Design a protein around this ligand. Structure first.
Ligand SMILES: [Mg+2]
Ligand SMILES: [Mg+2]
Ligand SMILES: [Mg+2]
Ligand SMILES: [Mg+2]
Length: 122
RNA sequence: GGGCACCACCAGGAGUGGAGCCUGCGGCUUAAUUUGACUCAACACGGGGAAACUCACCAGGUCCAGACACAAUAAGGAUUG
């Protein structure tokens, strides 16, 4: 299986982390959405009380929609790298990443862009 | 017994010790009147003539500048403002 299984969002996130352009957490994400900063939106599916998700949706709506599904949040966090050192390989203490919004991007083109386009044009 | 030296004395000078005042050091005083050093070899010495700084003392307040290791919160905020 050569085709990516929604692995042109995770990569983007990683890139952002590397270059320091991630609005992780909710307030930060909201802020990003509000001004010329928040370009891609990343909201958790499994949200208790549905409230955070709703908020995120609202934010997305407000001017320009940059949203996507997200696979449980924890996975995303893991991919990003939430934990120092963590032995030789893997073995990171699990953390729920919560709401994330992308600033900067950094890396250009590749499959992420395509995915974004697909999400957009309907 | 024999040497040597105006930090010994002679022969002399200038003196200090008195006077007032500076400044050191005691003693007392004081929250605290920071401390070191008392024969020459402590006492205008600490290059020490302190207005704060210096600064060590006292009365009061501020600050972490608690490197690093390992867990409790680990974003429904750690703590920073
Ligand atoms: Mg002598
Ligand atoms: Mg004096
Ligand atoms: Mg003298
Ligand atoms: Mg003076």
């Amino acid at each position: 299986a050569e085709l990516t299984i929604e692995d042109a969002l995770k990569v983007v996130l990683r890139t952002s982390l590397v270059h320091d352009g991630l609005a992780r957490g909710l307030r930060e994400s909201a802020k990003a959405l509000t001004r010329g900063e928040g370009q891609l939106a990343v909201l958790v599916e499994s949200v208790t009380e549905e409230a955070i998700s709703k908020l995120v949706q609202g934010l997305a709506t407000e001017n320009n929609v940059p949203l996507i599904k997200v696979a449980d949040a924890k996975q995303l966090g893991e991919w990003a790298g939430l934990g120092k050192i963590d032995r030789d390989g893997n073995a990171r203490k699990v953390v729920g990443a919560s709401v994330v919004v992308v600033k900067n991007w950094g890396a250009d083109t590749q499959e992420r862009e395509i995915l974004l386009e697909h999400f957009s044009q309907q």
